[PDB]
Structures are given as structure tokens and as C-alpha cells.
Design a protein around this ligand. Structure first.
Ligand SMILES: OC[C@H]1O[C@@H]2O[C@H]3[C@H](O)[C@@H](O)[C@@H](O[C@H]4[C@H](O)[C@@H](O)[C@@H](O[C@H]5[C@H](O)[C@@H](O)[C@@H](O[C@H]6[C@H](O)[C@@H](O)[C@@H](O[C@H]7[C@H](O)[C@@H](O)[C@@H](O[C@H]1[C@H](O)[C@H]2O)O[C@@H]7CO)O[C@@H]6CO)O[C@@H]5CO)O[C@@H]4CO)O[C@@H]3CO
Ligand SMILES: OC[C@H]1O[C@@H]2O[C@H]3[C@H](O)[C@@H](O)[C@@H](O[C@H]4[C@H](O)[C@@H](O)[C@@H](O[C@H]5[C@H](O)[C@@H](O)[C@@H](O[C@H]6[C@H](O)[C@@H](O)[C@@H](O[C@H]7[C@H](O)[C@@H](O)[C@@H](O[C@H]1[C@H](O)[C@H]2O)O[C@@H]7CO)O[C@@H]6CO)O[C@@H]5CO)O[C@@H]4CO)O[C@@H]3CO
Ligand SMILES: [Ca+2]
Ligand SMILES: [Ca+2]
Ligand SMILES: [Ca+2]
Ligand SMILES: [Ca+2]
Ligand SMILES: [Ca+2]
Length: 1054
């Protein structure tokens, strides 16, 4: 009405002042402030500081004297000065700092690369590190839309820095095109006016990382629905109406404030009801949603405009029951801020529960149909209780992958290899071995991603695996024909045969096994699968038939076989912390095509999707993604009967969201167990992260890296010689040093503190004697600066010495073992390492194949290293060690230490594999042989668990843990013993325990039964009660119980 028009400056868009000639570059400085003319500006003090280094050396006559300010403009016009800079060449780059006198106008060393700017004529603006190809580009950067640092966070609140102390602050909006200056240089699109305000108490709680932003108020009567359906741009301008800045707007907060309450009350996806099928998708900013129905062979057979619910922003449509089994997509008409286009594209359902091949179409499914269930499904029971804390503590996890299990097993029928259904091949080597492990006390199979991953092509015609002819690899992988292995295209042999042949002359100098495998990896069936395409459909490539609903019944047939034939519970790895892709174009961008910029976490200034997870970071702090996560877990829980969930990068989730999700799932099944990897995501400024520290008391488990690093040695980022120098307790730190290490006795005793603390459940308040003889709480033992112990209960701690990521335990032992440790001794180092986990109070977790000395040929990160490096040989011929140098892209800087250590001893064969398996099953049998091993409750651990051989004069490497079942502990939780002693002698010397002299201690019956094959072979208990431990041994001893609960092994009050 009376409002002043916002406009561009009343000056033209500038052309170039000069263009560089030969052996010249030209830099324009675009004088934004003086473009708002007034005074004819003076550029005499403007100058360039120019110098040559090794990166950029194309300057003819640089002057290194920083106090020389004589490189003043060559000329100037109304848009600013410019510099003609002589060069020695027209390739490369030059270094420049843009100054007024000795003050930098741009606080950033500038690179001007002649490759990026071919005409070598660039423009820059004060207070801006960007180099522009032209003055027009730079001009439109200053007077044009840029970045996205405005945040519309609820109905009436915009947070934006660009607005602070400006006469005009307005929220412009255009339904159908990009807000831009019109032909009169004016911004004539509709706008809402914003007045300064103060951030409110609940916005600052919601977005703490934004609470220091200049706040602004919208009229209470603004119709948010209309603004949110197109582009919105926050604009600020001076008194005269000249644009000061303009930026795109992030709207996830106001979307939640507007719609989330209503939208959370609805159910989503294609849902079978009484009357028929209800489709519902959440798309609060979409202009149109059309439900497209497809025939089996993917012809459109109907297209239905959906009904928008204005309270929720959800779109719904109702049709007949005959739509069960039909394929469908949502045809979206929606503005995407990244492209600033009203996009039109068909997207699969984020609540899809069935998919076509390679996830191209979603499919209507009723998971309850008996046709999709194996016989007996509805009565499938959990073979291991998870109700009490003592129940949870018994959990003993075997972390497995669908291809790692069966890809190599000739006794698995060929068509089931690398498939869910391989777990049904009851006579196979793999299933029999798993059945043996279960009988001995492995309780849980944990499955690497078996939700719908993106990074395997489910069209089998497009895939070549190493068991197929090399000619098939050349057919599907067009890079092989121009590679140095092209000659094998005609060879008539398989890829597996070629890789084997390449072993012979493979070395750090000729890494040819790895070279061929990198090409194999692009088109094979192999990936860990941490690449979410759809969260609540099984992966299709693990199915015999990926087209439609078949995968659902095969997945359940697998789940049933694991629980019912193998006797184990099932944990799923889940990856809700990121999506595989974002933006409006990428094939696997689903969530971000339907509600752009809502499901991804964005940079607060640029609005780019963050990638701290690896990929496209998600936003579980946002309410409708929290609901998606929880609804997703409900399907896996109820419809697939999953006993627990391991959250990948759980630290990227809010603690409140994880706990919310968990309460939601416990209402379905109270015994469901949640845990994850809870490091530091660097998100604590946005919310309270779900980290090891913050989850104390909550009952949410976390992987503990404390005992892990103490027993393995070093840490996951070690490289080069450090891989060998950093020995662990399991590999003889301080007692059997290798030729490189400098580990001191103090350092070795510190690792033993971390190990003891972990064997008592890594509790914050457990009290032990440390390396110096000092009394310490678990939280007082240092771990790389953090409090070491952090939990309230041992069930909150998952101990392990090996996992899918980072090197296998055997490869660590190979890096670190002294040259004098022979093969048999390294096998005992492996079992000694695993004993710290298996006999500890924390939940026990292990990588598939540790019982077979599993190797990945030193591969640190094998996620895409194929069948070759991830092989597990259930025919027990070898442990996959020394099968070629690992991938150079990630382990090249370790080739030197690998070649130095690799051949110290023979590669394990069947004799060593069987011995390790017996050791492993001995350990797992011991773990479940008494309730004392798995007390579950932190206060109960504190009252019953203690250690001998502590303090500054301990025998290094001897771990002696006592577990009290005598009167002062309380109740006798174990009818056969008054106490247990665990002795792990990780040392080359035989040792004698006198702590139990005169006490009637005796060796556990399990170990006596193993005899010569026991980890305790040769242990001697003398008449006086002194115990002699062999080198590299594990012994479990017990005080036999009498007619009543005895004195046992009382914990000392320290
Ligand atoms: O070999 C010298 C140097 O070469 C390269 O530096 C570039 C640099 O990247 C450009 O930015 C520019 O440097 C300018 C600065 O931009 C400008 O601000 C000013 O620097 C002042 C500093 O702000 C101020 O701290 C102080 O510098 C000290 C400094 O604190 C000391 O630590 C010491 O610096 C040494 C560096 O630590 C060392 O790495 C190396 O520097 C390299 C650099 O690696 C490379 O990127 O050597 C220096 C010592 O020679 O000494 C100085 C003592 O003054 O004071 C200066 C103002 O005097 O000025 C510099 C240029 O003089 O250009 C340089 C290339 O010249
Ligand atoms: O985060 C980027 C990272 O991505 C991948 O790493 C994985 C890794 O495979 C997993 O083990 C896990 O890492 C966890 C650890 O399990 C956990 O212990 C903790 O790590 C701490 C270390 O124990 C401790 O030594 C220290 O690490 C330092 C380290 O000495 C530095 O070198 C530096 O690390 C950098 C790496 O060198 C670099 O390769 C990359 O890491 C990638 C990695 O390549 C990939 O496989 O970037 C990091 C930058 O941080 O700094 C760190 C810390 O400053 O401290 C750490 C941190 O507490 O936590 C980590 C995860 O944070 O998960 C990661 C991520 O998926
Ligand atoms: Ca140019
Ligand atoms: Ca898939
Ligand atoms: Ca692959
Ligand atoms: Ca951040
Ligand atoms: Ca007892």
C-alpha cells in the first residue's frame, strides 16, 4: 500500500572492464559499496599482494614484500578498479590477496586457476572469497538470491542474520517461478512483512543452534499453506528500498509447527483396510500429488489426483481391494529449493513395504497375508529371553552378512548362495557350523543391512560375480576391456580363477589382485549395504526373485530358520542416520523428492545437505522423520519378528528420539533391545545426542570402544608402523614386545585397567585399583581423554574385539605379534583376546568368523571389497589370510608394514581353524555356564565383581577377576558355586596365583572336559590351593558350594 518498493540498485548490470591478453590475467574488484554511487570513489590505496609458491607459480614479477603497496589498479570505471597482471604462462594459477593499503579486503588467500577461468579475467568482491568469471556474476551475487540462511522455524518466527538492523525485512513468495527482480529491476512478487522480535523460549529449545539468530515476526494472520507451496525468499533492503541481501528459506521448523501434530495422527503408505486400499503420503509443500497405478509389466493403468488434508499436509486416496499387489508411484508436482524449480517426477513410497526389481516401483502389500508367511510363522517364538537385565546380559552376538555366510559354501545349493534362504540349507557346512556355535552359546545373529539397500543392482543381467566366467564380467563392466586384464575376456576361466592366478606374483609393488577386484566391485553382488533406498522393505538381491512380494516370504523363512532351526535371536542393523542420496534428480533420492529439505539435515547457512555420516545426513530431530523411523521399526518388530535393533551412527540421533522410538516399540514387544554406536557426531549444539555418555541409565546399549582398543592395540585410525607398534593386551603389550614398539610398562598396565573395567561392564562407578595402585572409579580411568567407564548397567555396554568395520582381530594380531610368536601362539592370542569379551559382564559381540581366525588380507574397510576379501571358508581350509594386498585406495599407506609382517608364520589351515573353533565354543559355553557371568545389573556387579593382581607391581598381562556368590554379596545366584575366578594369562610366562591358597578352588568342569584342547590345558591346582597358569591361557575356576551359601569371594571396600 504505502510500502516502499524493494529494488536492485538503479545501475546496469556491469560488463567487463578489460579482457586479459596473452601472458596476462585480469582481476576486477567490483565496488559494491561505491556502486551505490554518491562520491566518485578513489581506488589509489587499493592494491594486490602477489606471490609465487609451489601450488601457483604463474606470476611474472611478484613482489614478496608485504609492506609494498605499489601494485595499484591498472584502471577503473564506475564499477571498481582492475589489475592487469603479467604472467609467465597461461596455465596453472596465481596467488593474490586483495588489499586496501596493508589491510585485506578479502581475508583469504585467493587462488585464481586458469583451468577454471579460461579467459583469466575474474572478479571478486570485498568480504567474499569466491572468484567469479565475470563482473556480472559477482554483481548478481551481491544483489541477488544467494545461500539459504533464513530459517522459518514456526508460524510467526523467521530467524535470519541478513535482516538484523535493516529498514525493510520481508518474506517474499512466488507460487510458480523463482523470485527475481522484474524488468523494472523491482521485486514485485507478493510478500509478508517482518518486524524485529525476540526469539521465544520454545523456539530456542527446539533449535538451540539458531537461538543467536536475529529474530523476526510474521503477522498472526499469514496463510502459511499458501507460502509453503512455492519458493519463499527472505529479502532485506535499505531505507530507499535498495536490496541489501536475499536468501532462500529453510522451512522444516514451520512445517512441523504447522502440520506435525495432525500428520502424526495418520498412517502412511498403501494400506489394506476393510473397504479396500487407502494410500497416504506426507507432502505438505506439494502443489499436486497424483497416485499412478501400474500393471505388472509397468503400464500406467490408472492415475488418481489425491486428496489434500489441510490440517496435516498429507495426501490420501481410496480405491478397491483389487489394488493389492499393484505397483504404484506418487507423481509429484513440488518446488525443490535446491533446484528452485517446481519439479515433476514420480517417486516410490517412503512407506513402501514391497518393491519391484531394483526398487523402481512400490507395490501394494498386506504383510499379514498367510501367503507371505512360512508355515507356523504366527507362532514363532524367541529362543532366548530378553526380559530381565540378566536375560539381556547373556546376549552373545554373531555379526553376519548374507553373502559372507554362503557365497563360498559349495554345500549350499548354488541357487541359495548369497541368499536369505541359504540359512534353510540344513546340511550345509555353514548352517551346521552355525548350529554348533548356537549349541555352545552363541545366542544372537546380527544381520548387516537386509533392508532395501541402493548399491547392488538387483537386475541379475547387470551383475557379474567372481564365480561366473570372466567373459560375463567383461560383458557387464565396460571398464574391464580397457584395463590391463582385458586379455582375460577370452580366457574361458572364471573371475575367481583369475584372481587366484593373480595371487602368485602379487606384492606391494605389483598389487594386481586388488587391481582386478576394484573393477569386480563395481558390478558384483557385494556390499555391506549401509546405503538406504527404502527403510521398510527387505533387500531384493538376497531374494531368489526380486520382482514383487517374493522377498517377503523368503526373508521370513530365513528369520524362522534362524530362530527355530538354529536356536538364535535376530538383530537387524538399521541405518536411519542418512539416506543414500538427496536432491531432485538422483535415482535413490526418495524422501527429499517428496518433502524437499525436510528429511535431510542441512547446513544452517548454505542449506546444503550435510555429509558427516558419509552420505546424505538425515534429520531424526524432525517430527515426521521420527515418526517414519518409529513406524518402520514397528513393521520389522511386528511383521518380521526382529528381536532387536543396532542403530548405525546412533550418535547422529537425538537421545529423546531414540528413547521415544524405544517406548513406541516396547508397547509392541516389551523385550525388544536397542543399541548402537554412540560416538561424537558433532551434533550436540542442535540437540542432546544419543551418545555413550548421555545414554547412561536409559537401558539403550552402546558399543564400547574401551576394552576393544585395549585388547586389540592402538585405534582404528592407526596407519603404517603404528599398526605394529601399538600392541594390545591380546597381542602381548609390555610382555612380548615386537621389534618396533615403545610401549612402556605403565602404558601396558593402563590397557589392563581398560580391559578389567570392560570385563566388569565398563560402569562409570565400578571401583578398581589402577595401574599405579590408586583407587579409581570407572569414569576416572582415562580413555583418550574421555571418562573410560560410562554406563550404569553392563547391559548398556557391548564389548567386542572384532566387527565388520576396521581390521579383523586376526589381521591385528598379525600386524602386532612379535616375530617369535609362532602360529599356535597367535591362535591362543586370538582366543585370549576373545576371552576378555566372552567372560566379561558386558553384552558380548563378535564378528562372524572370529572362531575361524577370519582374515581380510589386511583390508581395513571391506564394505565394497567383494567376495574375495570378505570370504569365510566353512570348509575350514584357510582363514582367507594372504590372498593379495588389500585395496590401495584405503590401505596403500600400509603396504610397507604389511609386506614386513605378512609372512612371519604359516597361514592357518584346517588344524588351526578347528582348534580356534573349539577354543571359541569353550569360551561361549563358559559364559552361559553360570548366572555369575551375566549379572545384568550395575549395582549387582559392583557388589560381586573384583580383581586380583592389580597395582604398580602386578604381573603384566595377567587378568584375574573374581565374582562373589557368597553371603556378603547377597543371595546365592548360583547353586553350585560360592564364587568364580577368571584368569586370563596374556603372557609368555607361566604364572602362579597365591590369592586363593587354602580355599578348595577347582577348575571348571567344561575346561577339564576339553582336556588337551582346553584354553586351560596344563593348568595346575595344587593341594594348598595355589594355581599355576600356562602361558597364553584362560582358566575359569570355582569354589564348590556346600550345604549353604558360603563366604565365597567378598569384594573389598576400597
Ligand atoms: O615463507 C613464508 C610463508 O609463505 C607462505 O605464506 C604466505 C601466506 O599464505 C599469505 O597469506 C601471505 O602471508 C601474509 C599474510 O597474509 C599477512 O597477514 C601478513 O602476515 C602477518 C601475520 O598475520 C602475523 O602473524 C605475522 O606473521 C608472523 C607469524 O606469526 C610467525 O609464525 C612467522 O610466520 C612463519 C610461518 O609460521 C611459517 O609457516 C612460514 O610462513 C610461510 C607460509 O607457510 C606460507 O603459507 O614462515 C613464516 C616466517 O617467515 O613469522 C611471521 C613474522 O612476521 O606477521 C605478518 C606480517 O609481517 O604478511 C604475510 C606475508 O609477509 O603471503 C605469504 C607469502 O609471503
Ligand atoms: O569419521 C570419519 C571417519 O569415517 C570412518 O571411520 C569410522 C571408523 O571406521 C569406526 O571405527 C568409527 O570410528 C569411531 C571409533 O570406533 C571410536 O573409537 C571413536 O574414535 C576415536 C579414536 O579411537 C581416537 O583414536 C581419536 O581418533 C582421532 C584420530 O587419531 C585422528 O587421526 C583423526 O581421525 C580422522 C581419521 O584419521 C580419518 O581417516 C577420518 O576418519 C574417517 C575414516 O577414514 C572412516 O573409516 O577422519 C577422522 C577425523 O576425526 O581424528 C580423530 C578424532 O579427532 O578420536 C576418535 C574420536 O572420538 O569415534 C569414531 C567415530 O567418530 O566410526 C567412524 C565414522 O563412521
Ligand atoms: Ca572471465
Ligand atoms: Ca536394493
Ligand atoms: Ca560391490
Ligand atoms: Ca553442525
Ligand atoms: Ca552360590
Amino acid at each position: 500500500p504505502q510500502d516502499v518498493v524493494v529494488r536492485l540498485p538503479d545501475v546496469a548490470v556491469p560488463g567487463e572492464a578489460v579482457q586479459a591478453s596473452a601472458r596476462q590475467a585480469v582481476i576486477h574488484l567490483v565496488d559494491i559499496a561505491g556502486i551505490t554511487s554518491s562520491t566518485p570513489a578513489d581506488y589509489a590505496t587499493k592494491n594486490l599482494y602477489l606471490w609465487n609458491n609451489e601450488t601457483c607459480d604463474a606470476l611474472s614479477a611478484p613482489v614478496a614484500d608485504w609492506n609494498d603497496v605499489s601494485t595499484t589498479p591498472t584502471g577503473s570505471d564506475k564499477y571498481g578498479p582492475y589489475w592487469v597482471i603479467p604472467l609467465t604462462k597461461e596455465s596453472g594459477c596465481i596467488n593474490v590477496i586483495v588489499r586496501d593499503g596493508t589491510n585485506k579486503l578479502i581475508d583469504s588467500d585467493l587462488r585464481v586457476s586458469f583451468s577454471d577461468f579460461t579467459d583469466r579475467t575474474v572478479s571478486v568482491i570485498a568480504g567474499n572469497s569466491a572468484v567469479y568469471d565475470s563482473r556480472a556474476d559477482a554483481f548478481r551475487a551481491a544483489f541477488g538470491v544467494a545461500l539459504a540462511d533464513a530459517h522459518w522455524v514456526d508460524k510467526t518466527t523467521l530467524l535470519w542474520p541478513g535482516g538484523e538492523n535493516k529498514p525493510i525485512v520481508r518474506l517474499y513468495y512466488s507460487h510458480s517461478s523463482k523470485v527475481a527482480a522484474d524488468s523494472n529491476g523491482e521485486f514485485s512478487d507478493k510478500y509478508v512483512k517482518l518486524t524485529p522480535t525476540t526469539v521465544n523460549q520454545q523456539v530456542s529449545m527446539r533449535f538451540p543452534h539458531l537461538a543467536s539468530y536475529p529474530a523476526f515476526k510474521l503477522p498472526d494472520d499469514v496463510n502459511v499453506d499458501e507460502l509453503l507451496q512455492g519458493e519463499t525468499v527472505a529479502i532485506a533492503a535499505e531505507s530507499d528500498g535498495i536490496l541489501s541481501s536475499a536468501t532462500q528459506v529453510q522451512t522444516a521448523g514451520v512445517l512441523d509447527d504447522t502440520y506435525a501434530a495432525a500428520a502424526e495422527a495418520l498412517s502412511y503408505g498403501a494400506q489394506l483396510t476393510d473397504s479396500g486400499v487407502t494410500f497416504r503420503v506426507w507432502a505438505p509443500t506439494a502443489q499436486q500429488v497424483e497416485l499412478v497405478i501400474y500393471s505388472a509389466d509397468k503400464k500406467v493403468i490408472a492415475s488418481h489426483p489425491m486428496t489434500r488434508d489441510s490440517a496435516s499436509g498429507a495426501w490420501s486416496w481410496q480405491g478397491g481391494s483389487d489394488l493389492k499387489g499393484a505397483f504404484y508411484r506418487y507423481a509429484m508436482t513440488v518446488y525443490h529449493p535446491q533446484s528452485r524449480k517446481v519439479e515433476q517426477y514420480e517417486v516410490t513410497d517412503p512407506y513402501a513395504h514391497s518393491l519391484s526389481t531394483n526398487s523402481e516401483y512400490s507395490q501394494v502389500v498386506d504383510l499379514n497375508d498367510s501367503a507371505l508367511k512360512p508355515e507356523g510363522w504366527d507362532g514363532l517364538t524367541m529362543p532366548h529371553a530378553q526380559k530381565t537385565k540378566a536375560d539381556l546380559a547373556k546376549m552373545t552376538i554373531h555379526e553376519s552378512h548374507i553373502r559372507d555366510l554362503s557365497a563360498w559354501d559349495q554345500t549350499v545349493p548354488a541357487e541359495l548362495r548369497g541368499k536369505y534362504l541359504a540359512l534353510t540349507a540344513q546340511e550345509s557346512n555353514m548352517v551346521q557350523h552355525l548350529k554348533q556355535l548356537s549349541a555352545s552359546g552363541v545366542t544372537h545373529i546380527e544381520l548387516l543391512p537386509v533392508f532395501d539397500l541402493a548399491t547392488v543392482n538387483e537386475f541379475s543381467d547387470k551383475v557379474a560375480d567372481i564365480q561366473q566366467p570372466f567373459s560375463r564380467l567383461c560383458e557387464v563392466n565396460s571398464a574391464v576391456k580397457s584395463s590391463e586384464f582385458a586379455g582375460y575376456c577370452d580366457s574361458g576361466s572364471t573371475v575367481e580363477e583369475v584372481l587366484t592366478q593373480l595371487k602368485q606374483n602379487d606384492s606391494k609393488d605389483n598389487p594386481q589382485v586388488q587391481a582386478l577386484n576394484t573393477l569386480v566391485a563395481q558390478t558384483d553382488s557385494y556390499n555391506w549395504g549401509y546405503d538406504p533406498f527404502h527403510y521398510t522393505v527387505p533387500e531384493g538381491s538376497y531374494a531368489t526373485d526380486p520382482e514383487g512380494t517374493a522377498r517377503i516370504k523368503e526373508f521370513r523363512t530365513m528369520i524362522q530358520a534362524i530362530k527355530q532351526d538354529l536356536g538364535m535371536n535376530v538383530i537387524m542393523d538399521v541405518v536411519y542416520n542418512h539416506t543414500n542420496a538427496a536432491g531432485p534428480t538422483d535415482r535413490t533420492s526418495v524422501l527429499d523428492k517428496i518433502v524437499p529439505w525436510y528429511y535431510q539435515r542441512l547446513n544452517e547457512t548454505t542449506g546444503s545437505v550435510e555429509s558427516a555420516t558419509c552420505c546424505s545426513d538425515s534429520a531424526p530431530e524432525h517430527r515426521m522423520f521420527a515418526k517414519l523411523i518409529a513406524d518402520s521399526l514397528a513393521v520389522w518388530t511386528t511383521d518380521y519378528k526382529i528381536d532387536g535393533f543396532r542403530f548405525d551412527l546412533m550418535l547422529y540421533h537425538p537421545k529423546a528420539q531414540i528413547l521415544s522410538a524405544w517406548e513406541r516399540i516396547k508397547a509392541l514387544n516389551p523385550d525388544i533391545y536397542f543399541f548402537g554406536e554412540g560416538w561424537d557426531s558433532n551434533q550436540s549444539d542442535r540437540f542432546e545426542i544419543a551418545s555413550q555418555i548421555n545414554l547412561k541409565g536409559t537401558g539403550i546399549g552402546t558399543f564400547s570402544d574401551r576394552l576393544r582398543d585395549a585388547v586389540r592395540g592402538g585405534g582404528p585410525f592407526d596407519s603404517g608402523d603404528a599398526l605394529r607398534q601399538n600392541q594390545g593386551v591380546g597381542s602381548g603389550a609390555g610382555v612380548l614386545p615386537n621389534e618396533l614398539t615403545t610401549l612402556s610398562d605403565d602404558q601396558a598396565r593402563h590397557l589392563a585397567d581398560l580391559t578389567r573395567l570392560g570385563m566388569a561392564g565398563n560402569l562409570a562407578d565400578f571401583v578398581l585399583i589402577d595401574k599405579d595402585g590408586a583407587v579409581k572409579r570407572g569414569s576416572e580411568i582415562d580413555y583418550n581423554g574421555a571418562p573410560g567407564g560410562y554406563a550404569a548397567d553392563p547391559t548398556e555396554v557391548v564389548n567386542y574385539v572384532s566387527k565388520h568395520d576396521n581390521q579383523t582381530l586376526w589381521d591385528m594380531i598379525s600386524y602386532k605379534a612379535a616375530q617369535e610368536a609362532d602360529l599356535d601362539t597367535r591362535v591362543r592370542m586370538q582366543a585370549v583376546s576373545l576371552a576378555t569379551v566372552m567372560l566379561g559382564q558386558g553384552i558380548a559381540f563378535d564378528q562372524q568368523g572370529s572362531e575361524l581366525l577370519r582374515s581380510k588380507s589386511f583390508t581395513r574397510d571391506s564394505y565394497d571389497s567383494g567376495d574375495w576379501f570378505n570370504r569365510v571358508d566353512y570348509s575350514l581350509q584357510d582363514n582367507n589370510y594372504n590372498v593379495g594386498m588389500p585395496r590401495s585406495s584405503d590401505d596403500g599407506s600400509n603396504y610397507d608394514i604389511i609386506a614386513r609382517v605378512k609372512d612371519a608364520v604359516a597361514t592357518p589351515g584346517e588344524t588351526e581353524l578347528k582348534q580356534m573353533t573349539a577354543f571359541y565354543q569353550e569360551l561361549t559355553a563358559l559364559r552361559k555356564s553360570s548366572p555369575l557371568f551375566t549379572l545384568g545389573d550395575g549395582a549387582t556387579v559392583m557388589k560381586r565383581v573384583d580383581f586380583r593382581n592389580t597395582g604398580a607391581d602386578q604381573q603384566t598381562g595377567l587378568l584375574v577377576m573374581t565374582i562373589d556368590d557368597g553371603m556378603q554379596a547377597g543371595a546365592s545366584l548360583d547353586s553350585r558355586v560360592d564364587g568364580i575366578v577368571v584368569a586370563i594369562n596374556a603372557a609368555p610366562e607361566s604364572r602362579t596365583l597365591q590369592d586363593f591358597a587354602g580355599t578348595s578352588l577347582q577348575l571348571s568342569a567344561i575346561q577339564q572336559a576339553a582336556g588337551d584342547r582346553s584354553l586351560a590345558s596344563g593348568v595346575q591346582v595344587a593341594a594348598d590351593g595355589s594355581v599355576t597358569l600356562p602361558a597364553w591361557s584362560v582358566a575359569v575356576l570355582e569354589l564348590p558350594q556346600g550345604e549353604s551359601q558360603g563366604a565365597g569371594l567378598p569384594v573389598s571396600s576400597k
